[PDB]
Design a protein around this ligand. Structure first.
Ligand SMILES: Nc1nc2c(c(=O)[nH]1)N[C@@H](/C(S)=C(/S)[C@H](O)COP(=O)(O)OP(=O)(O)OC[C@H]1O[C@@H](n3cnc4c(=O)[nH]c(N)nc43)[C@H](O)[C@@H]1O)C=N2
Ligand SMILES: Nc1nc2c(c(=O)[nH]1)N[C@@H](/C(S)=C(/S)[C@H](O)COP(=O)(O)OP(=O)(O)OC[C@H]1O[C@@H](n3cnc4c(=O)[nH]c(N)nc43)[C@H](O)[C@@H]1O)C=N2
Ligand code: HEM
Ligand code: SF4
Ligand code: SF4
Ligand code: SF4
Ligand code: SF4
Ligand code: F3S
Ligand SMILES: [Ca+2]
Ligand SMILES: [Ca+2]
Ligand SMILES: [Mo]
Lengths: 1120, 409, 292
C-alpha cells in the first residue's frame, strides 16, 4: 500500500549507486566448503604442492598453497618464502581433466585380443594376426571388462607368451621371425625376458609407478614355473628405461665427470652473475622456477641465450646469439681457444680437478701409464682413500682404472699420481703439475715415445677452430662470440645451462662435453651459482641413494629378493634381502624397429656396434604406467604399422584414453593425483622438497584403482593361476592397504631420507602436513661442491673433469677429442663428418663411401675432414628439397601428452583456438601448428594460416614401405596449419611436442562427422587432422652411447660400474636429427576459400600494412 | 564536464563529474619477469568464466606484443580511431614534485584527443569512439604467441639496449579505470564504480545487453554472454578483496589472478596517498610502473614496469613518456626497489605498508655503466591495521649438512 | 544535458488522429496466434504512425523503419493491439556478440491525464515523477518459447561447439548438478534477470520515468504473439483491460488515454536509444461495451 517506486533512477555511476544487493551473485559463486592438499606430479619436474577448493564435495578450482616458508628438514633447516607461488597454468585446469570427456572410466580389453585368448592362443601366423587384428589395431573395438576379467585375461596371456618363447623351441621361433641371434641369446632361455615392464618416470610416484620394476622382478617366479628352474637360475621381466628413452640425459656427463646428470636446486641459479643458456627454454619449460633466472637481471647478473630462434628465453637475455642448429660444439671450442690463447684461465683450478695436466701418449692416444715408464711399478694402494670409503670402489675395478702420469714442475720429470690425488691433495704431496709441455720419454722396453700435455694437444686441436672459421660453421656474430668469451673470463660465478634443444641431436655427447670446456678453465664448477648443467624431466631415482651407512635405497623397493621377501612391517631397510632379477633395457631399441646397431660394413663385414651390456631382447609383452609411450614414441606410425603387430600383448595403465590405449590390448583406469586411496612418495631434481600425498582428495569419479593395487591385483591373479603364494607376499603390504611400509623402507636406507618417516612427514612434523626436505650436503644442492671444497675425486677414470676420453671404442670413432661433428641427417653438408685436421684424431671410416644414404651407414661413418673441405660437401636430403630443420621443443601449454587436449589449454597453444569451432575443418577446440619464417612460406606459395604437409625422407618416414594409396598412409602423413613467425631463421621450422596423434578412427570421424571434429567413437580426440609431429622423426642408434668400457658411477648406489646402466650411459634418443620438406596443402580461409581471416586485416607478421608499420615503429605517439 | 586526469596531466572531457574512490584498486606488473605462462589466465577462467555462454571469455589474458592480442589486433583497431598528428606528449612542465593522490602531471601533458574527445569533436552522437569485436575476432586468445618483430636483414642479432628481433608479454585485466569508457557508455547507468575500492561492476540485475560497454571500452574487457543475454566483465574478485575468503582470516586478499602469478611479476594493492605503500611508492614516487595506453583517457590502474629490451619508441607510445626513466631505475635496481621487488608474490594477503630491516652486503659490481651494490635486506609487509603479514630476505641462505650426505649423486 | 537535445514543442503536443479500440466479442483459442486474430482486426480501423531515427539523446540510432500500422480491439475483458511494419530481415535471436533482436514496443501513461504544452508530459519514455508503462515485444523471446527448455542456448548459434563439462555425455550426476546450479551459472541467471531466464512469455511488462530509467516489473502481465512473412512483421499485444498491479496502465471502456510507439531492427544494430521512435503521444479511445 506504500507508494511504489515505479522506476530505478541512477545519478552518477562514478559517485553513487542506488541498489547493490545484487553483488551477492559473485560472492555466492566464490563460496567453497572445504579445502584439501595434493601434489601435481606429471613429469613436470616441479611436483608442486597444491591446495584445491571444494564446493559440496566437487573439486571446483585450485590455488597455490603459499607454503614454502614452512618447508624444513630433520636438522631444522628451512626454506624461504622466495620459492612462492610456483605453479603452472596446467595445474589450475587439472580438474577439467578430472571431470572431462577424455577420462578413462572402466577397464578395457580389445575385442581381437579377447577373441584370440578365447580361441586358445593359437599361433600368430600372418593370417591369425589379420584375423585377430594385430596388424590393424586402430579399427578394432575396446570393450568393457571387469577388473577380475581384465586381470585374468592379462595374466593368462602373460603365462602363455612367456612360456611360448621361453624354451629352445621358443628361441627358434624368434629366429624364424627375424630377430638377431644376439637379442635371442640375451634372453638366456628365459621367456619372461620378452616381457617389457616400464614404470613410466616412477619418481612421480615411486610405489605406484616404479612398482612396475618390482612386478618385472616378480616375474622370475613365472619363469620358474615355465622352465622348472631354481631361484638362482630364474629371471624375470626387463625394466624399461625412462630418462634416456626421452632423450633427457646429457650423454657427455658420464664422460666429463662420470655422474648421471649435473643439475641444481634452481634457487642456486639466482646466485649466478653471468648465466648462459644454450639448448634450453627455461621460461617455457621450468616455469615455476623460472623466476630464479628472470631475476638475475635484477641483482647485477648477465643473461645469455644461444638459440637459432628468438625464444621466450631470449627476451631476458642481455644479448642473444643466433646459431646454426647442431653446431654448438664448434662455438664453445672457439671460445675455449680464445680462453687459452690469452691465458684467461685459472691455471691453479685446472692444475687440480682437471685432466689437462695429465700427459697423453702418441702411439695409442691413451694417457701415459706409470706401468709403461716406471720399471717394476705397482699401482698405489688407495684402499684407505676416499675412493673406497666414500665412492665405493672395488679392487677389481681399481686394477682396470689404473694410475696416470703428470709432469711435476718442482722435480723436472714424469710423476705418478692417483685418482684420489686431486685438488689440494697434490699440494700436500710434492706434485705441482705442468699444464704445458711436450716431452720425450722412453718406455720400459726402451722404445722411445713422445708424450705431451692434453692442453698442448688441445692447443694443436684448436687450430681448426679459429674465430673466423667457427663463424662460418655457426653463422654466429663474431662480436658476440668474443663478447661471451670475455664475459666468461671476467665474471664469477659463470653457469652454462642446456637441455634437449641440444641433447636431441646426434652429437649431443660431444656438445655436453663441449659445455664444460669454458667452465673447467675458469674455475666455475662446484661453487654456488656456477657449473655446467642440463635440464630435463624428473629422473632422479638416485635420490633414494644407496650406501653402506644408509642401506639399499631404491633397490629395497625394486630389487628386493622375490623368493626371499621380508613380511615384517617393522623391518629396517637393512633387514631386506636385496637381489634384483630384472635386467634393465633401453626403450630405444624397440623404437629402432627392435634391432640393435648392426651395420653390414664393407671393410669388416657384419659388425655390431652395440655393447653386450646394452644388448636388448625381443618385445612380445608390454605394459606401462604413467606414460603415453606409443603416442609419444618417436617414428610412431612405423611402430604401429610394422613393429607393434608382432608385439603379442600391449597394456597401458592411465587415467585418460590417450591413443596409446587406442592401439593397445589392455587399459587399466588408475586414480589421478586427487583420487589417491593410498599414500605416494615423490621427489624432484630441481627442488630439494619431498611431497607425500593421498587419501585426502575426492572419491574416484569412475571405476578406477590405485596403481599399487593394479600391480598387486595383476600379481595376485598370476599367483592364483599358478597356485603360488609368493606372488602376494611380494605385494603383501600393498594389498593390505599399507604402502607406508614400503615408503618407510625407501626413506630408511637412503642417504637423503634416512631418519624421515612417512607417517611423520605426512603430519607436519617438518612444517607443511605433506612436505619435508631430503638431505643433501647443501640446501642449494650444487653438484661437485664437496669435490672442490674438500678435494674429493670426481667419478671419472681420472677422478677429474675430462676433456679427453682414451677408451678404445671412442678413439676408433674419432671422438677422443672434443670435436665438432655434423649430424648424420641434420646438416647441409656431409652427414656425420668430423671437422678437424688434428693428426691425433685417427678414426676408422669402416670403408663406408661418402655416397651412403642408408641411416645405419651414416651412423658409423667416422671420416675426418677439414672445415674448408666440408663446406664443399653436400647432404643428399638437403639438395632434393628437404632443407628445413624441424625442431620439436616442449610447450608451456602441455606437459607432453597432458593438457594437449584439455579444451582450455587446447585453445591457447595455437593461433586458431575456438571453443565454438566455426571452421569445421579444425580437429577440436584447437589444432596443432607449425612455425615457419614468412619468407620461407612465401617462397613455397604458403600464406599464414594455410594447411601444409610436413614430409621427411620418403625411405624412412612416415613408415617404411608406405605407398600413396594405403589407407594408413592417410593417417600417417602430417597436415597441419602454418604460422608466420619471423623469430625463426629461414631454414628452421618448429612444432611443439606432443599433441594427441591422429589415429585410424579420428581420421574416419574427421571425414564422416558433419561438424568435422576428429573425435573417435571411443572418446579419443586427435590434435591433428592427419598425421602427427612424430611423422617426421626417427630413432638414431649412437655408437657413443653403447660402450662397454665407460667407468662411470651407478645412479642408485655410491658405487662404480662399467658399461650400460639404464638411465645412465645408454641410448639417448634424438628427435631433432631430422630435416623436412614443406608443401602447401589447403587454403587457410574458412571453407578453403580465400586466406585466413587475420591476414586480411593487414595487421599480421609478414603482411603488415602501412598503418601497422606505423604501429610497430611506435610512430602513433611522439614526445616533444 | 571537464575532469582532471593525472596520466595526461590535463583536464579531460567526461559525462560525469570527477569523484575518485577513497583508494583505488591498483597493481604493478613487472613485465621483465613475465613468462607468458597464462597461469593468471586460468585462475580467472576456472573461477568466474568457466560455464555456459562464456566459452570465449578470457577476462585475464596475456598477449605477445606487438603482433598479439585478445581480441585480435584490439590495440591497433582502437588506436586507429584516434589517430591524429596532434597526439603528442610534452614533458618539460612535468611535475618535479610528487602530487597528492589523484592530482598532478607526472609524465607531462598529452595534447591529443581521448576516445571521449574524439567522439565530441566529430559530433558522432556517442560518448566515445569504439567498435564491437565480431565473434570471429574473439577467437584465438593466444593470437600471435611468441611472434617477434624482425628487421629482416641477414646479419640480425639481439642485444641491449634494444633487441632488433623482439617481443614481450602484456598481461591485461579490467583496468578498473577512474573514468571508464564502459561506465560512460551504458545509457542505463548499469555500470558503476565503487567509491570504497574503485572496482567497476556491471549490475547483472539491471543490465539489458546493450553492448555499448563492449562497443566503447577501448580495452575490450566487457564481454557479452550469449546464454544470459547480458554483458559481464572482470569483477576484481571483490569477495576476495572484501575479506570473504577464510584463508586470509577476514583480511583483504589479493585478487585471484594476482595471487596466481608464477614469475612473481604482479603486486596488487591500493593507490593511497601513503608513500609507504609499496603500490603508491612504485607508481607515483618511483614512476617505474606506468599505465597501459593512457592515450585512451580512461586512467587505467594497472601499471607496468616496461621491458628493458623492447624498442623505446614502441614502449613510449604504449606507456607514455615515463618509460625511459623507469627502465633506467630497473636495470640497476636501487637498494629500496630491489627489496620492494622482492616483496612480490610472497603472500596472498594484501600489504598496505612496507618497511625494511637492513642486512649485510652480499655482492657488488659495475653493470650497464653504473655501480650496483646488493645487500641481504629483510623486507616486511603490513596489513590494514599495521600488523605484519609477510617477511622475506633479498638473498637466499645456504645450509651445510653432515658429510655423510652427498650432493654429487 | 550534454548527451540530450531539448524537448521540442512538436514532441509535447499530441498527434491529431485518434486510435479507436473497436468493441467486438473476440473468440480465441488457448494458444493465441496472429492468424486467429486476423479476422477480428480486419473489421477495425487503424492509424498509420510515422517513425523517425532517435536523434534526441545519446546514443543516436535508427531510421530503418519509417511507418507502422496500429490497430486495436477489445472484449470488455481483454485488449489487443496489432502493430505492423516492414522489415527485410528476420533477426530472431541475440546470442552472438554482433547480433541483435528485432523488437517493438508500446507505452502508455499510467493514470488519467490530458497532455498539452501547458501541461507537459514528455513522450521520451515518460519523465521524472511522471511514470509510464511499457510493453516490449522481443523476437528472440518468440524463438525461446519454442526451445526445448524455454530459452535458446549457445549450441543453437554455434552447433560445432564443444565444452569439456557442458557438452560431456559422461558427466557425473553431482558434478553437473553443482556446476550448472543457479549459483554457479551466475550473472542474469543467478540474479534472476528476466533476459537470462525462460520467461514463458514474449512481451516484457515494464515501467519507466524517463529514458535511462527503464525498469522491469516484478509482476509481468502482458503477453503476445508474432508473425514475420514476406519482409514484414505483424505483432499483436495481449493484456487484460485491468490488472492487480498498480504500476500497470488501467483501461476502462469508454475512456480515452494516449500511447506511443517504437520499433527496433537488429539488422541495423538497434538496442536502447537506437530505436525507430514516434516523436509524439498518440490519442487512444476505447469504445463502450454493447451491453445486451
Ligand atoms: N618428436 C619428439 N619426440 C619426443 C620429444 C620431443 O621433444 N620431440 N621429447 C621426449 C621427452 S624429453 C619426454 S619427457 C616425453 O615426451 C615424456 O614422456 P611421457 O610419455 O611420460 O609424457 P606424458 O605426459 O604423456 O606421461 C603422462 C601419461 O600418464 C597419465 N597420468 C597422469 N597421471 C597419472 C597417474 O597418476 N597414474 C597413471 N597410471 N597415469 C597418469 C597421463 O594421462 C599421461 O598419459 C620424448 N619424444
Ligand atoms: N610447462 C612445462 N615444463 C616442462 C615440460 C613441458 O612439457 N611443459 N617438459 C618437461 C621435460 S620431460 C623436458 S625434457 C624439458 O621441458 C625439455 O625442455 P627443453 O627446453 O630442454 O627442450 P627444447 O626442445 O624446448 O629446446 C630448448 C631450446 O633449444 C633450441 N634449439 C633447437 N636446436 C638447437 C641447436 O641446435 N642449438 C641451440 N643452441 N639451440 C637449439 C630450441 O629451439 C629451444 O628454444 C619438464 N619441463
Ligand atoms: C526521443 C525519444 C526516446 C529516447 C531518446 C529514448 C531513449 C532510450 C534509452 C536511453 C534507453 C535505454 C535506457 C533505459 O533502458 O532506461 C531506451 C530504451 C527503451 N525504450 Fe526509449 N527512448 C525514447 C522513446 C521511446 C518510445 C517512444 C518507446 C516506445 C514504447 C520506447 C521504449 C523503449 C524500450 C522498449 C526500451 C528497451 C530497449 C531494449 O530493452 O532493448 N522509448 N530508450
Ligand atoms: S603442472 Fe607442473 S608446474 Fe603446474 S602445478 Fe602441476 S607440477 Fe606444478
Ligand atoms: S578497462 Fe574497460 S571495462 Fe575496465 S573499467 Fe576501463 S573502460 Fe571499464
Ligand atoms: S581480477 Fe579477478 S575477475 Fe578480474 S581477471 Fe583477475 S581473477 Fe578474474
Ligand atoms: S602468471 Fe604471471 S608470469 Fe605467468 S603469464 Fe600471468 S602475469 Fe605473466
Ligand atoms: S551498455 Fe549497459 S545495458 Fe549492459 S551490455 Fe553494457 S552494461
Ligand atoms: Ca530485422
Ligand atoms: Ca504488471
Ligand atoms: Mo624429458
Amino acid at each position: 500500500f506504500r507508494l511504489l517506486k515505479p522506476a530505478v533512477v541512477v545519478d552518477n555511476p562514478l559517485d553513487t549507486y542506488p541498489d547493490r544487493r545484487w553483488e551477492s551473485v559473485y560472492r555466492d559463486q566464490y563460496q567453497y566448503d572445504r579445502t584439501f592438499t595434493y601434489c601435481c606430479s606429471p613429469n613436470d619436474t616441479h611436483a608442486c604442492r597444491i591446495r584445491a577448493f571444494v564446493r559440496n564435495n566437487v573439486m571446483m578450482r585450485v590455488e597455490q598453497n603459499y607454503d614454502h616458508q614452512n618447508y624444513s628438514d630433520l636438522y631444522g633447516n628451512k626454506a624461504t618464502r622466495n620459492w612462492n607461488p610456483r605453479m603452472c597454468l596446467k595445474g589450475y585446469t587439472f580438474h577439467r581433466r578430472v571431470y572431462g570427456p577424455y577420462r578413462l572410466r572402466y577397464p578395457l580389453i580389445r575385442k581381437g585380443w579377447k577373441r584370440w585368448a578365447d580361441d586358445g592362443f593359437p599361433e600368430l601366423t600372418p593370417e591369425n594376426k589379420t584375423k585377430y587384428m594385430f596388424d590393424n589395431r586402430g579399427n578394432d573395438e575396446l570393450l568393457r571388462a571387469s577388473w577380475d576379467e581384465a586381470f585374468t585375461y592379462a595374466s593368462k596371456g602373460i603365462i602363455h607368451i612367456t612360456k611360448k618363447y621361453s624354451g629352445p623351441e621358443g628361441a627358434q621361433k624368434l629366429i624364424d621371425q627375424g630377430y638377431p641371434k644376439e637379442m635371442v641369446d640375451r634372453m638366456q632361455g628365459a621367456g619372461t625376458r620378452t616381457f617389457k615392464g616400464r614404470g613410466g618416470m616412477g619418481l612421480l610416484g615411486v610405489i605406484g609407478k616404479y612398482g612396475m620394476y618390482r612386478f618385472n622382478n616378480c616375474l622370475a617366479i613365472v619363469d620358474a614355473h615355465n622352465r622348472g628352474v631354481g631361484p638362482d637360475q630364474a629371471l624375470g621381466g626387463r625394466n624399461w628405461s625412462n630418462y634416456t628413452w626421452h632423450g633427457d640425459q646429457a650423454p657427455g656427463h658420464p664422460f666429463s665427470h662420470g655422474l648421471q646428470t649435473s643439475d641444481v636446486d634452481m634457487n642456486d641459479v639466482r646466485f649466478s652473475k653471468l648465466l648462459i643458456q644454450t639448448g634450453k627454454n627455461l621460461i617455457e619449460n621450468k616455469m615455476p622456477e623460472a623466476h630464479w633466472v628472470t631475476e638475475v637481471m635484477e641483482r647485477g647478473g648477465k643473461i645469455v641465450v644461444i638459440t637459432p630462434e628468438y625464444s621466450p628465453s631470449a627476451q631476458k637475455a642481455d644479448y642473444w646469439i643466433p646459431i646454426r642448429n647442431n653446431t654448438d660444439t664448434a662455438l664453445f671450442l672457439g671460445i675455449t681457444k680464445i680462453l687459452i690463447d690469452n691465458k684467461w684461465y685459472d691455471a691453479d683450478y685446472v692444475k687440480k680437478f682437471t685432466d689437462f695436466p695429465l700427459l697423453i701418449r702418441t702411439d695409442t692416444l691413451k694417457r701415459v701409464s706409470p706401468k709403461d715408464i716406471i720399471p717394476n711399478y705397482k699401482l698405489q694402494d688407495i684402499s684407505d682413500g676416499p675412493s673406497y670409503h666414500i665412492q665405493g670402489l672395488k679392487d677389481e675395478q681399481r686394477e682396470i682404472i689404473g694410475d696416470f702420469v703428470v709432469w711435476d714442475a718442482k722435480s723436472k720429470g714424469p710423476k705418478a699420481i692417483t685418482r684420489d690425488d686431486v685438488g689440494e691433495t697434490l699440494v700436500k704431496k710434492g706434485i705441482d703439475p705442468v699444464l704445458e709441455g711436450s716431452f720425450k720419454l722412453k718406455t720400459i722396453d726402451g722404445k722411445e715415445i713422445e708424450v705431451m700435455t692434453l692442453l698442448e694437444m688441445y692447443k694443436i686441436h684448436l687450430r681448426d677452430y679459429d674465430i673466423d672459421s667457427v663463424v662460418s660453421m655457426t653463422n654466429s656474430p663474431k662480436d658476440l662470440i668474443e663478447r661471451l668469451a670475455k664475459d666468461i673470463a671476467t665474471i664469477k660465478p659463470v653457469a652454462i645451462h642446456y637441455g634437449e634443444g641440444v641433447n636431441h641431436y646426434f652429437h649431443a655427447t660431444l656438445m655436453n662435453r663441449s659445455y664444460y670446456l669454458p667452465v673447467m678453465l675458469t674455475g666455475n664448477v662446484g661453487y654456488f651459482g656456477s657449473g655446467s648443467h642440463t635440464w630435463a624431466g624428473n629422473y632422479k631415482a638416485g635420490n633414494f641413494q644407496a650406501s653402506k651407512w644408509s642401506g639399499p635405497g631404491f633397490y629395497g623397493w625394486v630389487a628386493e629378493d622375490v623368493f626371499k621377501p621380508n613380511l615384517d612391517p617393522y623391518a629396517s631397510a637393512k633387514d631386506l634381502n636385496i637381489k634384483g632379477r630384472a635386467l634393465d633395457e633401453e626403450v630405444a631399441y624397440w623404437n629402432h624397429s627392435e634391432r640393435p646397431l648392426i651395420v653390414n660394413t664393407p671393410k669388416y663385414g657384419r659388425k655390431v656396434f652395440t655393447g653386450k651390456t646394452h644388448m636388448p631382447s625381443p618385445t612380445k609383452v608390454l605394459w606401462f604406467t604413467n606414460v603415453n609411450l606409443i603416442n609419444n614414441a618417436k617414428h610412431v606410425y612405423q611402430m604401429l604399422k610394422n613393429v607393434n603387430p608382432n608385439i603379442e600383448q600391449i597394456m597401458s595403465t592411465d587415467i585418460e584414453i590417450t591413443g596409446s590405449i587406442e592401439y593397445a590390448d589392455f587399459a587399466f583406469p588408475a586414480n589421478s593425483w586427487v583420487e589417491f586411496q593410498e599414500f605416494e612418495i615423490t621427489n624432484s631434481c630441481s627442488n630439494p622438497f619431498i611431497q607425500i600425498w593421498g587419501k585426502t582428495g575426492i572419491t574416484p569419479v569412475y571405476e578406477s584403482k590405485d596403481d599399487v593395487k593394479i600391480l598387486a591385483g595383476m600379481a595376485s591373479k598370476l599367483g592364483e593361476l599358478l597356485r603360488d603364494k609368493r606372488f602376494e607376499d611380494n605385494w603383501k603390504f600393498a594389498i593390505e592397504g599399507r604402502a607406508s611400509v614400503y615408503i618407510n623402507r625407501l626413506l630408511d636406507g637412503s642417504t637423503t631420507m634416512k631418519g624421515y618417516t612417512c607417517e611423520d612427514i605426512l603430519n607436519g612434523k617438518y612444517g607443511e602436513p605433506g612436505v619435508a626436505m631430503l638431505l643433501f650436503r647443501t640446501y642449494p644442492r650444487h653438484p661437485f661442491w664437496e669435490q672442490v671444497h674438500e678435494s674429493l675425486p670426481f667419478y671419472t677414470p681420472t677422478g677429474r673433469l675430462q676433456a679427453y676420453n682414451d677408451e678404445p671404442e671412442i678413439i676408433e670413432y674419432g671422438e677422443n677429442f672434443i670435436v665438432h661433428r655434423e649430424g648424420p641427417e641434420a646438416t647441409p653438408y656431409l652427414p656425420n663428418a668430423i671437422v678437424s685436421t688434428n693428426p691425433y684424431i685417427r678414426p676408422d671410416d669402416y670403408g663406408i663411401p661418402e655416397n651412403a644414404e642408408y641411416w645405419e651407414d651414416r651412423t658409423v661413418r667416422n671420416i675426418k675432414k677439414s672445415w674448408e673441405e666440408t663446406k664443399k660437401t653436400k647432404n643428399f636430403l638437403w639438395e632434393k628439397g628437404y632443407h628445413f630443420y624441424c625442431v620439436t621443443p616442449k610447450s608451456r601449454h602441455t606437459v607432453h601428452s597432458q593438457w594437449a587436449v584439455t579444451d582450455w589449454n587446447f585453445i591457447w597453444n595455437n593461433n586458431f583456438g575456438d571453443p565454438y569451432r566455426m571452421d569445421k575443418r579444425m580437429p577440436g577446440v584447437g589444432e596443432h601448428q607449425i612455425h615457419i619464417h614468412p619468407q620461407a612460406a612465401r617462397d613455397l606459395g604458403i600464406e599464414d594460416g594455410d594447411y601444409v604437409y610436413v614430409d621427411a625422407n620418403p625411405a624412412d618416414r612416415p613408415y617404411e614401405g608406405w605407398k600413396p594409396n594405403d589407407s594408413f598412409y592417410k593417417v600417417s602423413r602430417l597436415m597441419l596449419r602454418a604460422k608466420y613467425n619471423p623469430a625463426y631463421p629461414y631454414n628452421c621450422t618448429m612444432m611443439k611436442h606432443s599433441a594427441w596423434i591422429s589415429s585410424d578412427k579420428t581420421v574416419q570421424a574427421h571425414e564422416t562427422r558433419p561438424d568435422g571434429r576428429a573425435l573417435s567413437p571411443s572418446g579419443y580426440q586427435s590434435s591433428f587432422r592427419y598425421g602427427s609431429q612424430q611423422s617426421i622423426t626417427r630413432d638414431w642408434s649412437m655408437p657413443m652411447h653403447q660402450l662397454d668400457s665407460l667407468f662411470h658411477k651407478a645412479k642408485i648406489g655410491m658405487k662404480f660400474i662399467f658399461g650400460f646402466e639404464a638411465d645412465n650411459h645408454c641410448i639417448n634418443t634424438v628427435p631433432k636429427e631430422t630435416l623436412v620438406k614443406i608443401t602447401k596443402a589447403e587454403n587457410g580461409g574458412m571453407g578453403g576459400k580465400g586466406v585466413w581471416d587475420p591476414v586480411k586485416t593487414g595487421y599480421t607478421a609478414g603482411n603488415e600494412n602501412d598503418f601497422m608499420k606505423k604501429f610497430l615503429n611506435g610512430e602513433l605517439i611522439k614526445v616533444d | 564536464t571537464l575532469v582532471h586526469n593525472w596520466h595526461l596531466g590535463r583536464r579531460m572531457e567526461y559525462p560525469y563529474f570527477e569523484s575518485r574512490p577513497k583508494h583505488q584498486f591498483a597493481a604493478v606488473f613487472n613485465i621483465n619477469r613475465c613468462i607468458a605462462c597464462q597461469t593468471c589466465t586460468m585462475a580467472c577462467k576456472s573461477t568466474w568464466t568457466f560455464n555456459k555462454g562464456q566459452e570465449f571469455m578470457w577476462w585475464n589474458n596475456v598477449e605477445t606484443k606487438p603482433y598479439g592480442g585478445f581480441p585480435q589486433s584490439w590495440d591497433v583497431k582502437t588506436l586507429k580511431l584516434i589517430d591524429s598528428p596532434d597526439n603528442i606528449w610534452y614533458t618539460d612542465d612535468k611535475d618535479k614534485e610528487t602530487s597528492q593522490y589523484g592530482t598532478g602531471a607526472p609524465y607531462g601533458t598529452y595534447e591529443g584527443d581521448t576516445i571521449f574527445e574524439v567522439a565530441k569533436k566529430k559530433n558522432i552522437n556517442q560518448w566515445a569512439v569504439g567498435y564491437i569485436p565480431e565473434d570471429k575476432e574473439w577467437r584465438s586468445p593466444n593470437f600471435g604467441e611468441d611472434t617477434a618483430k624482425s628487421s629482416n636483414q641477414p646479419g640480425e642479432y639481439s642485444t641491449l639496449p634494444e633487441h632488433s628481433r623482439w617481443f614481450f608479454y602484456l598481461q591485461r585485466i579490467c583496468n578498473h579505470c577512474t573514468y571508464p569508457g564502459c561506465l560512460a557508455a551504458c545509457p542505463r547507468k548499469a555500470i558503476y564504480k565503487r567509491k570504497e575500492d574503485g572496482i567497476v561492476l556491471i549490475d547483472q540485475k539491471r543490465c539489458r545487453g546493450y553492448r555499448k560497454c563492449v562497443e566503447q571500452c577501448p580495452y575490450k574487457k566487457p564481454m557479452y554472454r550469449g546464454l544470459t543475454r547480458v554483458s559481464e566483465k572482470c569483477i576484481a574478485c571483490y569477495p576476495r578483496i572484501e575479506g570473504r575468503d577464510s584463508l586470509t582470516d577476514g583480511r583483504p586478499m589479493e585478487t585471484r589472478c594476482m595471487s596466481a602469478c608464477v614469475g612473481q611479476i604482479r603486486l596488487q594493492g591500493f593507490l593511497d596517498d601513503n608513500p609507504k605503500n609499496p603500490i603508491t611508492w612504485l607508481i607515483r614516487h618511483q614512476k617505474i610502473a606506468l599505465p597501459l595506453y593512457p592515450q585512451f583517457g580512461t586512467e587505467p590502474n594497472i601499471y607496468y614496469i616496461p621491458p628493458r629490451w623492447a624498442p623505446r619508441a614502441y614502449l613510449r607510445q604504449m606507456f607514455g613518456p615515463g618509460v625511459d626513466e623507469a627502465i633506467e631505475k630497473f636495470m640497476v635496481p636501487s637498494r629500496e626497489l630491489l627489496a620492494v621487488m622482492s616483496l612480490f608474490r610472497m603472500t596472498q594477503t594484501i600489504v598496505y605498508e612496507y618497511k625494511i630491516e637492513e642486512g649485510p652486503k652480499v655482492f657488488e659490481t659495475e653493470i650497464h655503466g653504473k655501480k650496483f651494490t646488493m645487500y641481504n635486506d629483510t623486507v616486511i609487509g603490513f596489513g590494514e591495521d599495521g600488523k605484519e603479514v609477510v617477511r622475506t630476505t633479498v638473498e637466499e641462505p645456504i645450509h651445510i649438512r653432515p658429510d655423510k650426505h652427498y650432493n654429487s649423486i | 544535458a550534454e548527451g540530450v537535445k531539448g524537448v521540442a514543442e512538436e514532441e509535447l503536443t499530441p498527434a491529431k488522429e485518434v486510435l479507436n479500440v473497436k468493441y467486438m466479442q473476440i473468440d480465441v483459442p488457448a494458444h493465441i496466434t496472429v492468424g486467429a486474430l486476423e479476422g477480428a482486426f480486419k473489421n477495425a480501423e487503424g492509424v498509420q504512425v510515422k517513425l523517425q531515427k532517435q536523434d534526441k539523446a545519446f546514443p543516436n540510432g535508427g531510421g530503418s523503419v519509417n511507418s507502422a500500422e496500429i490497430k486495436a480491439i477489445h472484449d470488455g475483458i481483454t485488449i489487443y493491439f496489432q502493430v505492423i511494419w516492414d522489415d527485410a530481415t528476420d533477426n530472431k535471436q541475440a546470442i552472438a556478440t554482433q547480433e541483435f533482436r528485432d523488437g517493438a514496443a508500446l507505452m502508455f501513461p499510467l493514470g488519467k491525464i490530458t497532455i498539452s504544452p501547458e501541461e507537459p508530459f514528455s513522450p521520451r519514455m515518460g519523465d521524472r515523477q511522471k511514470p509510464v508503462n511499457l510493453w516490449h515485444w522481443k523476437a528472440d523471446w518468440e524463438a525461446d518459447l519454442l526451445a526445448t527448455g524455454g530459452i535458446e542456448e549457445c549450441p543453437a548459434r554455434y552447433p560445432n561447439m564443444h565444452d569439456d563439462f557442458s557438452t560431456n555425455p559422461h558427466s557425473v550426476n553431482y558434478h553437473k548438478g553443482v556446476i550448472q546450479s543457479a549459483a554457479e551459472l551466475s550473472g542474469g541467471y543467478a540474479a534472476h534477470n528476466l533476459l537470462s531466464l525462460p520467461r514463458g512469455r514474449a512481451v516484457e511488462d515494464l515501467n519507466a520515468e524517463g529514458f535511462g530509467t527503464l525498469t522491469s516489473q516484478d509482476h509481468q502481465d502482458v503477453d503476445g504473439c508474432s508473425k514475420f512473412e514476406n519482409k514484414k512483421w505483424t505483432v499483436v499485444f495481449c493484456r487484460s483491460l485491468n490488472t492487480g498491479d498498480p504500476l500497470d496502465v488501467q483501461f476502462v471502456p469508454g475512456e480515452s488515454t494516449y500511447f506511443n510507439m517504437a520499433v527496433w531492427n537488429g539488422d541495423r544494430e538497434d538496442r536502447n536509444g537506437q530505436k525507430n521512435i514516434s516523436i509524439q503521444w498518440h490519442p487512444l479511445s476505447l469504445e463502450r461495451i454493447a451491453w445486451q
